[PDB]
Amino acid sequence: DPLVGVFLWGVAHSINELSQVPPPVMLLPDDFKASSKIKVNNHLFHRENLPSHFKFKEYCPQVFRNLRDRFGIDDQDYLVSLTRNPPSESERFLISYDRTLVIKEVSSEDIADMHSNLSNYHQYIVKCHGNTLLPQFLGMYRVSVDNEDSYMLVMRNMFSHRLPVHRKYDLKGSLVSREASDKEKVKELPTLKDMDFLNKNQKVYIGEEEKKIFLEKLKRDVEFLVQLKIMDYSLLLGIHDIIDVYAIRSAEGAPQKEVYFMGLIDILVHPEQYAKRFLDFITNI
Amino acid sequence: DPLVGVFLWGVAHSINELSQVPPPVMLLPDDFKASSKIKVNNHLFHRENLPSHFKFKEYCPQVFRNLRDRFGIDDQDYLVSLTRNPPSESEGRFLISYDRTLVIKEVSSEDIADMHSNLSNYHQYIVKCHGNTLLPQFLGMYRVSVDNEDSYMLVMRNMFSHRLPVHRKYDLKGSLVSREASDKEKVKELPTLKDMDFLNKNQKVYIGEEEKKIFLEKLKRDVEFLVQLKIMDYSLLLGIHDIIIDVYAIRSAEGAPQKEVYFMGLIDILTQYDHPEQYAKRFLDFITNI
Ligand SMILES: Cc1cc2c(Nc3ccc(S(C)(=O)=O)cc3)ncnc2s1
Ligand SMILES: Cc1cc2c(Nc3ccc(S(C)(=O)=O)cc3)ncnc2s1
């Protein structure tokens, strides 16, 4: 795919360009308004695994470099995860070969919304020291191949780098409890919803100590989302039946040995009401 | 200087891009029509050691990569020579690599257009003589772009020494009209002296018949090649190191009254018709008489 090639080329280019820039002791407000653009035009030269004409744009390289550092990701390991071996594809979504990272395509409007809140997000990551249930935004890019702009967003993978997820839920806490379609339920790993969760009498057995840490994190993250006037997010719930930042192991007493994976996902009826109902639903899980 | 920074950035970029491309078993005619262009536009980023806006163009990367190989220069050593340490600035726009193995000369857009028409003829010639020539060794051709100027840069193997300092310098043409270095020129540390200066100083090159035969055979072919391309107005660069690898160096003969190392190459080979046979014969009559 031309896009993945340009994307991998671009990540290698931007990290190498960053390798020359010393990291600043502080991010200035203009670093949130910053971008790096490269336009390649090869005439009769490279026609192999990479197109002759393309553009690549990295948004706020200083901001995302610092966010990576806060999330404990070295710039070199980030590059290796993304480029040493090709990423695998899902249904537009990719996972790094090592399963540590995830690359999601987003729209131009999603990028515009992400810019308005990038400073508020950075300030929040500083305050909670990278310890959050929110997506860890690691890179934001625009790849251009044959009059087609694709906006790519790199995030830490919420699911395991080794353990396979056996059951998947998208929890919202909506008053009208949504259900996965007939078409969805025939897949190997369907994304089940609230009504599916309730109908299956599913419970998460993690123990009061881990639950307290989880609920405190969630409450702040959701309060932060409400302050940004954000709604329609979900709790991604992954269950593994018997390096992982979002993983919580089954309590010693649990009737089933499981590893749960939980994070906030569609963060791009008013916000206050969304949150209370959201938090009421996953507190009862 | 923004230009040197963009140039060094670009050389590092193009060599790394070349490091991914397997070298072809043969150069196709399109490789002589080829180029690599990169346009950078950084907004509210960098601002230290490099410009926010710039363009870099490498002409015929496959042709110049192969020419380097023929001249026995590995792509990695070429990159190190040019970028590990900054090049020193001489006079024109002319730079020398830190290690003194390479030389970078600014040229004009017309010079580049002339160089393209003859790049295939030059490559064919280098193949025939196995990189053993008195001509400049063209290693890279680039166009560096900044806010108010487009600069065409040409990398060549340095004709002078990488260790030994040149004590006397000549630009020999064999011109019917007397060529002499000006008053202003002669007050410099290393003036470029000309034909009349050479003759007035009763200058001689003491090399020995064996080395002279190799030199004159090389020169005759190179000049025949230049004439075939309708080229004239070239010069023989003569460098003399007075005694207390260099490709163009020839040491003094055992019999010589002075121990010296001479450095000789063909240099202003970009001029054409707008007569070459007459130029060549007049020129060769002059340099054989040394
Ligand atoms: C199964 C998995 C999904 C997933 C995921 N999804 C996701 C994150 C953020 C957003 S956004 C840009 O709208 O905030 C949207 C989707 N992110 C990390 N790991 C995993 S694993
Ligand atoms: C003192 C020195 C000059 C010099 C030199 N000059 C030069 C070569 C080629 C041309 S061109 C593009 O018109 O062919 C013009 C000038 N080239 C290599 N080493 C040295 S050392």
XYZ file of C-alpha atoms and ligand atoms in Angstrom:
617
model
C 0.000 0.000 0.000
C 1.499 3.421 -0.998
C 0.110 5.014 2.177
C 1.818 2.646 4.648
C 5.131 3.025 2.735
C 4.935 6.857 2.772
C 3.854 6.754 6.444
C 6.814 4.498 7.455
C 9.198 6.578 5.335
C 7.877 9.733 7.005
C 8.144 8.418 10.588
C 11.820 7.458 9.876
C 12.383 10.946 8.383
C 10.778 12.937 11.240
C 12.459 10.889 14.029
C 15.842 11.378 12.352
C 15.128 15.114 11.985
C 14.128 15.100 15.741
C 17.379 13.219 16.596
C 19.265 16.462 15.662
C 17.024 18.764 17.799
C 17.827 18.826 21.597
C 14.569 18.345 23.632
C 13.443 21.680 25.168
C 13.185 22.176 28.970
C 9.683 23.579 28.263
C 7.107 23.646 25.497
C 6.215 27.133 24.340
C 2.656 27.941 23.051
C 3.892 28.102 19.385
C 5.043 24.412 19.584
C 1.290 23.544 19.641
C 0.838 25.626 16.390
C 3.917 23.947 14.727
C 4.342 21.440 11.802
C 7.031 19.832 9.611
C 6.226 19.376 5.844
C 8.300 17.416 3.267
C 7.344 17.195 -0.459
C 9.187 14.529 -2.507
C 9.309 14.620 -6.304
C 11.554 11.920 -7.880
C 11.678 11.914 -11.682
C 12.607 8.492 -13.195
C 14.226 7.402 -9.896
C 12.524 5.249 -7.180
C 9.572 3.142 -8.421
C 10.097 0.451 -5.731
C 7.733 -0.072 -2.647
C 7.478 3.786 -2.490
C 5.835 6.255 -4.988
C 7.798 8.935 -6.965
C 5.516 11.851 -5.871
C 4.299 12.277 -2.237
C 4.077 14.647 0.788
C 4.399 13.959 4.521
C 3.427 16.276 7.426
C 4.187 15.862 11.150
C 2.020 18.004 13.461
C 3.609 19.551 16.568
C 6.809 17.331 16.529
C 8.057 18.913 19.800
C 4.670 18.327 21.540
C 4.368 14.650 20.495
C 8.048 13.987 21.220
C 7.481 15.177 24.801
C 4.176 13.213 25.108
C 6.099 10.010 24.092
C 8.682 10.785 26.832
C 5.839 11.244 29.395
C 4.357 7.909 28.367
C 7.817 6.330 28.771
C 8.460 5.688 25.074
C 12.044 6.367 23.794
C 12.029 7.917 20.254
C 14.251 5.083 18.921
C 11.965 2.265 20.291
C 8.951 4.121 18.833
C 10.669 4.145 15.380
C 11.678 0.438 15.607
C 8.093 -0.582 16.672
C 6.719 1.229 13.651
C 9.385 0.487 10.944
C 11.655 -2.596 11.719
C 8.764 -4.849 10.536
C 5.520 -3.854 8.688
C 2.332 -3.177 10.724
C -0.663 -5.554 10.451
C -4.119 -4.320 9.383
C -7.570 -4.441 11.008
C -11.063 -3.076 9.823
C -8.569 2.210 8.681
C -6.525 0.729 11.590
C -3.083 -0.868 11.952
C -1.140 -2.535 14.849
C 2.684 -2.538 15.062
C 4.456 -5.902 14.439
C 5.444 -6.046 18.163
C 1.747 -5.165 19.117
C 2.871 -2.222 21.363
C 1.481 0.510 19.095
C -1.673 1.130 17.107
C -2.039 3.563 14.052
C -5.560 4.906 13.323
C -6.691 6.948 10.352
C -8.701 10.029 11.331
C -10.365 12.877 9.363
C -9.301 16.509 8.762
C -11.999 17.675 11.285
C -10.652 15.190 13.876
C -7.172 16.836 13.443
C -8.676 20.376 13.849
C -10.425 19.236 17.110
C -7.197 17.557 18.288
C -5.254 20.827 17.829
C -7.685 22.923 19.921
C -7.279 20.513 22.823
C -3.615 19.417 22.391
C -2.409 21.975 24.942
C -5.197 21.028 27.395
C -4.269 17.324 26.878
C -0.554 17.924 27.418
C -1.274 19.903 30.662
C -3.398 16.963 31.857
C -0.702 14.345 31.042
C 1.818 16.472 33.003
C -0.550 16.615 36.039
C -1.330 12.835 36.141
C 2.323 11.849 35.149
C 1.232 9.774 32.078
C -0.937 7.532 34.343
C -4.322 7.617 32.560
C -7.152 5.565 31.000
C -7.251 8.034 28.051
C -5.593 7.143 24.681
C -1.836 7.965 24.790
C -1.456 10.203 21.703
C 2.101 9.546 20.392
C 2.124 11.037 16.831
C -0.121 12.912 14.406
C 0.645 12.851 10.643
C -0.752 13.709 7.248
C 0.338 11.471 4.333
C -0.282 12.620 0.735
C -0.326 10.110 -2.155
C -2.057 10.763 -5.576
C -4.467 13.631 -4.539
C -5.405 11.732 -1.309
C -4.612 13.087 2.175
C -4.788 10.547 5.014
C -4.459 11.632 8.594
C -2.758 9.069 10.798
C -2.695 8.937 14.549
C -0.246 6.699 16.531
C -1.391 5.547 20.000
C -0.241 3.020 22.590
C -2.183 -0.219 22.035
C -4.765 -0.728 24.799
C -4.882 -4.513 24.104
C -2.064 -7.039 24.748
C 1.282 -7.323 22.982
C 1.162 -11.108 23.599
C -2.232 -12.270 25.107
C -5.168 -12.700 22.640
C -8.481 -10.938 23.484
C -11.338 -13.489 23.586
C -14.239 -11.066 24.188
C -14.549 -7.367 23.307
C -17.021 -4.689 24.553
C -17.743 -1.017 23.695
C -19.465 0.382 26.818
C -21.248 3.797 26.808
C -23.846 3.668 29.601
C -26.498 5.127 27.225
C -30.150 5.269 28.439
C -31.042 3.349 25.244
C -28.645 0.335 25.683
C -27.256 -0.449 22.236
C -26.619 -3.985 20.912
C -24.151 -5.460 18.352
C -25.898 -6.287 15.001
C -26.486 -9.781 13.547
C -23.657 -9.115 11.026
C -21.246 -8.099 13.853
C -21.925 -11.186 16.044
C -20.833 -13.624 13.254
C -17.232 -12.207 13.309
C -14.421 -14.026 15.221
C -14.064 -11.093 17.669
C -17.270 -8.995 17.521
C -17.382 -5.613 19.240
C -20.246 -6.285 21.685
C -22.111 -3.415 23.391
C -23.995 -2.433 26.643
C -27.089 -4.657 26.067
C -24.815 -7.611 25.065
C -22.759 -6.983 28.281
C -25.901 -6.925 30.460
C -27.544 -9.937 28.712
C -24.362 -12.028 29.250
C -24.419 -11.146 33.041
C -20.692 -10.214 32.625
C -18.709 -8.979 35.614
C -15.073 -7.787 36.040
C -13.460 -9.426 39.124
C -10.340 -7.310 39.942
C -10.494 -6.618 43.714
C -11.225 -3.424 45.740
C -7.561 -2.293 45.790
C -7.255 -2.330 41.945
C -10.869 -1.133 41.484
C -10.205 1.946 43.723
C -7.103 2.860 41.589
C -9.113 2.305 38.386
C -12.226 4.330 39.443
C -10.128 7.244 40.704
C -8.269 7.380 37.331
C -11.557 7.103 35.365
C -13.326 9.847 37.390
C -10.474 12.419 36.708
C -10.238 11.392 32.963
C -14.009 11.728 32.519
C -14.025 15.074 34.520
C -11.259 16.234 32.092
C -13.340 15.085 29.053
C -16.458 16.960 30.410
C -14.348 20.146 30.934
C -13.467 19.877 27.189
C -17.266 19.597 26.338
C -16.564 16.045 24.974
C -19.283 13.331 24.769
C -19.942 9.960 23.049
C -16.713 8.266 24.318
C -16.696 4.571 25.247
C -14.918 2.200 27.581
C -13.056 -0.434 25.585
C -13.223 -3.725 27.478
C -10.978 -6.615 26.442
C -11.068 -10.025 28.186
C -8.265 -12.613 27.924
C -9.473 -16.019 29.234
C -6.816 -18.294 30.847
C 4.446 -3.952 28.898
C 0.547 -3.918 28.974
C -0.326 -0.466 30.457
C -4.168 -0.918 30.444
C -4.106 -4.544 31.785
C -5.586 -5.618 35.154
C -5.355 -9.236 36.386
C -8.298 -11.216 37.905
C -8.587 -11.085 41.719
C -7.318 -14.112 43.708
C -10.918 -14.978 44.651
C -12.329 -14.701 41.042
C -14.388 -17.665 39.691
C -12.512 -17.347 36.315
C -8.825 -16.527 35.680
C -8.882 -13.547 33.270
C -6.866 -10.457 32.232
C -8.959 -7.365 31.517
C -7.921 -4.470 29.191
C -9.730 -1.123 29.671
C -9.326 2.325 28.137
C -11.380 5.372 26.957
C -11.780 5.438 23.166
C -14.047 7.647 21.098
C -13.046 10.922 22.706
C -13.160 12.911 19.407
C -27.937 14.742 26.279
C -25.095 17.078 27.352
C -21.512 16.233 28.547
C -22.455 16.343 32.298
C -25.310 13.835 31.729
C -23.124 11.682 29.454
C -20.453 11.369 32.167
C -22.752 10.626 35.167
C -24.593 7.889 33.158
C -21.228 6.634 31.739
C -19.619 6.427 35.232
C -22.798 4.861 36.667
C -22.594 2.090 34.099
C -18.949 1.047 34.495
C -19.009 1.472 38.266
C -21.646 -1.379 38.107
C -19.296 -3.738 36.173
C 25.836 29.825 5.918
C 22.301 28.519 5.057
C 23.571 27.116 1.746
C 26.303 24.879 3.211
C 23.810 23.570 5.834
C 21.156 22.752 3.175
C 23.867 21.220 0.966
C 25.208 18.969 3.782
C 21.633 18.090 4.843
C 20.841 17.189 1.243
C 23.951 15.049 0.651
C 23.109 13.049 3.852
C 19.485 12.726 2.608
C 20.321 11.586 -0.949
C 23.044 9.085 0.151
C 20.616 7.560 2.666
C 17.919 7.420 -0.041
C 20.573 5.764 -2.340
C 21.441 3.278 0.472
C 17.912 1.754 -0.054
C 18.201 1.567 -3.899
C 20.132 -1.486 -5.282
C 22.797 -0.327 -7.844
C 21.716 -1.303 -11.403
C 23.785 -3.741 -13.546
C 23.632 -1.054 -16.281
C 22.650 2.574 -16.676
C 19.648 3.086 -18.916
C 19.225 6.306 -21.004
C 16.463 7.620 -18.624
C 18.983 7.606 -15.674
C 20.715 10.536 -17.454
C 17.304 12.404 -17.576
C 16.604 11.613 -13.843
C 16.475 13.778 -10.636
C 15.494 13.642 -6.939
C 13.697 16.748 -5.461
C 12.837 17.364 -1.770
C 10.962 20.496 -0.551
C 11.034 21.231 3.209
C 8.638 23.660 4.910
C 8.899 23.804 8.753
C 6.458 26.139 10.578
C 7.390 27.299 14.141
C 10.026 24.486 14.342
C 13.907 24.218 14.238
C 15.376 27.786 13.863
C 18.825 26.454 14.931
C 21.544 25.546 12.315
C 19.084 25.220 9.377
C 16.482 27.332 7.486
C 12.673 26.896 7.844
C 12.135 26.833 4.044
C 14.357 25.095 1.449
C 14.577 22.699 -1.541
C 17.303 20.237 -2.536
C 17.775 18.549 -5.933
C 20.170 15.717 -6.866
C 20.706 15.289 -10.625
C 21.037 11.768 -12.056
C 21.663 10.011 -8.639
C 22.194 6.635 -10.382
C 24.712 8.128 -12.890
C 26.788 9.936 -10.200
C 26.628 6.930 -7.850
C 28.177 4.791 -10.602
C 30.776 7.517 -11.488
C 31.868 7.549 -7.782
C 32.270 3.730 -7.956
C 34.389 4.070 -11.144
C 36.577 6.673 -9.438
C 36.947 4.260 -6.484
C 34.899 6.262 -3.977
C 32.533 4.286 -1.646
C 29.194 6.151 -1.048
C 29.727 6.082 2.746
C 33.302 7.568 2.568
C 31.963 10.252 0.178
C 29.283 11.183 2.778
C 31.789 11.217 5.687
C 34.265 13.410 3.669
C 31.474 15.897 3.033
C 29.499 15.850 6.353
C 31.500 14.439 9.396
C 33.267 17.866 9.605
C 32.396 21.178 7.803
C 34.223 22.033 4.519
C 36.678 24.997 4.421
C 35.894 27.972 2.120
C 38.364 28.985 -0.647
C 37.760 31.688 -3.425
C 35.807 31.790 -6.742
C 32.276 29.983 -4.678
C 34.663 27.095 -3.868
C 34.924 24.736 -0.909
C 37.348 21.891 0.082
C 36.346 18.893 2.288
C 37.772 18.772 5.857
C 39.938 15.738 4.852
C 40.997 17.620 1.585
C 39.958 14.663 -0.679
C 36.969 16.475 -2.222
C 36.237 19.911 -3.645
C 32.745 21.543 -4.110
C 32.323 24.195 -6.752
C 29.336 26.415 -7.368
C 28.323 26.495 -11.038
C 25.562 28.246 -13.020
C 22.251 26.945 -14.438
C 23.800 27.038 -17.996
C 26.800 25.013 -16.752
C 24.309 22.333 -15.488
C 22.443 22.316 -18.878
C 25.794 21.794 -20.711
C 26.794 19.093 -18.193
C 23.549 17.162 -18.882
C 24.028 17.071 -22.663
C 27.477 15.548 -22.203
C 26.919 13.421 -19.037
C 26.306 10.287 -21.114
C 29.368 11.016 -23.308
C 31.435 11.593 -20.121
C 30.226 8.374 -18.469
C 31.061 6.358 -21.668
C 34.549 7.930 -21.607
C 35.146 7.097 -17.910
C 34.118 3.495 -18.619
C 36.613 3.309 -21.579
C 39.615 4.747 -19.650
C 38.668 2.897 -16.352
C 38.494 6.142 -14.234
C 42.169 6.912 -15.139
C 41.968 10.500 -16.462
C 43.337 14.067 -16.208
C 39.744 15.419 -16.530
C 37.786 16.513 -13.397
C 36.165 13.469 -11.665
C 32.515 14.575 -11.451
C 31.115 12.948 -8.227
C 27.811 14.822 -7.578
C 25.591 17.521 -9.079
C 23.077 19.366 -6.878
C 20.753 22.342 -6.750
C 20.308 23.842 -3.283
C 17.400 26.292 -2.906
C 16.900 29.037 -0.264
C 14.750 32.219 -0.005
C 16.708 34.488 -2.422
C 19.104 32.186 -4.317
C 19.305 28.871 -6.237
C 22.840 27.459 -6.014
C 24.205 24.725 -8.252
C 26.907 22.717 -6.541
C 29.322 20.316 -8.144
C 31.446 17.842 -6.090
C 34.771 16.765 -7.647
C 37.874 14.924 -6.498
C 40.418 17.507 -5.341
C 43.274 17.783 -7.884
C 45.607 19.204 -5.191
C 46.974 17.302 -2.154
C 45.084 16.028 0.884
C 48.320 16.565 2.960
C 51.043 18.414 0.964
C 50.663 22.236 0.587
C 50.909 23.753 -2.935
C 53.656 26.407 -3.042
C 53.168 27.602 -6.654
C 50.045 27.512 -8.828
C 49.627 27.902 -12.645
C 46.658 28.098 -15.051
C 48.119 27.092 -18.457
C 46.241 27.604 -21.717
C 48.778 27.941 -24.546
C 46.896 31.058 -25.833
C 48.400 33.062 -28.728
C 47.738 36.230 -26.648
C 50.027 36.585 -23.565
C 48.186 35.693 -20.319
C 49.710 37.172 -17.153
C 48.467 37.294 -13.493
C 47.534 40.875 -12.461
C 49.349 43.069 -9.881
C 46.448 42.430 -7.445
C 46.724 38.622 -7.945
C 50.522 38.455 -7.364
C 50.221 39.957 -3.831
C 48.128 36.935 -2.625
C 49.798 34.088 -0.638
C 49.071 31.585 -3.461
C 48.441 33.564 -6.699
C 47.110 31.756 -9.768
C 49.960 32.486 -12.215
C 49.452 32.163 -16.011
C 51.407 31.242 -19.255
C 53.562 34.434 -19.456
C 54.384 34.069 -15.693
C 55.313 30.436 -16.303
C 57.600 31.354 -19.313
C 59.159 34.369 -17.504
C 60.072 32.153 -14.500
C 61.803 29.621 -16.910
C 59.553 26.949 -15.273
C 60.091 23.249 -16.018
C 58.439 20.002 -14.870
C 61.073 17.260 -14.201
C 59.138 13.969 -14.328
C 61.023 11.271 -16.259
C 60.142 9.646 -19.650
C 58.229 6.693 -18.115
C 55.834 8.995 -16.152
C 55.769 11.600 -18.971
C 54.681 8.895 -21.529
C 51.771 7.858 -19.197
C 50.854 11.540 -18.684
C 50.990 12.568 -22.407
C 48.979 9.511 -23.510
C 46.262 10.379 -20.928
C 46.282 14.090 -21.932
C 46.066 13.366 -25.710
C 42.898 11.113 -25.253
C 41.283 13.615 -22.760
C 41.896 16.548 -25.121
C 40.697 14.410 -28.167
C 37.534 13.698 -26.094
C 37.118 17.441 -25.311
C 37.524 18.331 -29.069
C 34.898 15.674 -30.022
C 32.510 17.518 -27.612
C 33.328 20.882 -29.417
C 34.855 22.137 -26.089
C 37.661 24.744 -25.876
C 39.027 27.415 -23.375
C 40.158 24.654 -20.870
C 43.302 24.981 -18.792
C 45.941 22.762 -17.280
C 46.033 23.287 -13.518
C 49.626 23.019 -12.341
C 50.393 22.709 -8.633
C 53.967 22.496 -7.276
C 54.833 21.201 -3.772
C 58.458 22.092 -2.897
C 59.931 19.254 -0.786
C 61.699 20.355 2.469
C 45.999 8.810 -2.299
C 46.618 11.941 -4.521
C 45.314 10.819 -7.975
C 46.770 13.795 -9.999
C 50.211 13.778 -8.251
C 53.526 12.993 -10.015
C 56.780 13.115 -8.008
C 60.067 14.654 -9.358
C 62.434 12.431 -11.375
C 65.499 10.998 -9.571
C 67.763 13.284 -11.645
C 65.726 16.515 -10.976
C 67.638 19.611 -9.672
C 64.751 20.256 -7.181
C 62.680 17.716 -5.180
C 59.041 18.550 -6.033
C 55.571 16.959 -6.329
C 53.514 18.211 -9.261
C 49.667 18.213 -9.430
C 48.100 18.429 -12.922
C 44.532 18.273 -14.185
C 42.215 19.768 -16.877
C 39.902 22.429 -15.435
C 37.670 24.852 -17.301
C 36.033 22.285 -19.543
C 32.541 23.808 -19.676
C 33.085 26.144 -22.758
C 31.746 25.393 -26.352
C 31.098 27.037 -29.829
C 28.756 30.222 -30.002
C 38.038 26.265 -33.594
C 38.269 23.376 -30.923
C 40.865 21.539 -33.047
C 43.002 24.760 -33.215
C 42.617 25.309 -29.462
C 43.710 21.677 -28.661
C 46.751 21.765 -30.988
C 47.910 25.204 -29.598
C 47.300 24.004 -25.981
C 49.110 20.639 -26.481
C 52.065 22.441 -28.140
C 52.381 24.526 -24.924
C 52.141 21.769 -22.228
C 54.398 19.306 -24.147
C 57.051 22.067 -23.875
C 57.570 21.573 -20.081
C -9.342 -2.865 19.924
C -8.556 -1.613 20.184
C -8.909 -0.331 19.930
C -7.921 0.619 20.348
C -7.908 2.032 20.266
N -8.969 2.734 19.722
C -9.200 4.121 19.636
C -8.478 5.030 20.425
C -8.716 6.386 20.336
C -9.674 6.856 19.452
S -9.953 8.596 19.363
C -8.798 9.139 18.157
O -11.273 8.845 18.863
O -9.575 9.149 20.635
C -10.424 5.979 18.682
C -10.174 4.620 18.760
N -6.833 2.686 20.767
C -5.825 1.981 21.310
N -5.768 0.652 21.388
C -6.829 -0.013 20.915
S -6.984 -1.722 20.934
C 43.142 24.744 -7.065
C 42.164 23.697 -7.514
C 41.190 23.796 -8.451
C 40.477 22.572 -8.652
C 39.425 22.256 -9.540
N 38.892 23.203 -10.400
C 37.887 23.096 -11.381
C 37.498 21.844 -11.864
C 36.538 21.740 -12.849
C 35.933 22.879 -13.346
S 34.694 22.690 -14.590
C 33.217 22.478 -13.677
O 34.589 23.908 -15.343
O 34.967 21.475 -15.299
C 36.312 24.136 -12.900
C 37.279 24.243 -11.912
N 38.937 20.991 -9.522
C 39.472 20.090 -8.677
N 40.460 20.330 -7.818
C 40.949 21.576 -7.814
S 42.222 22.114 -6.785
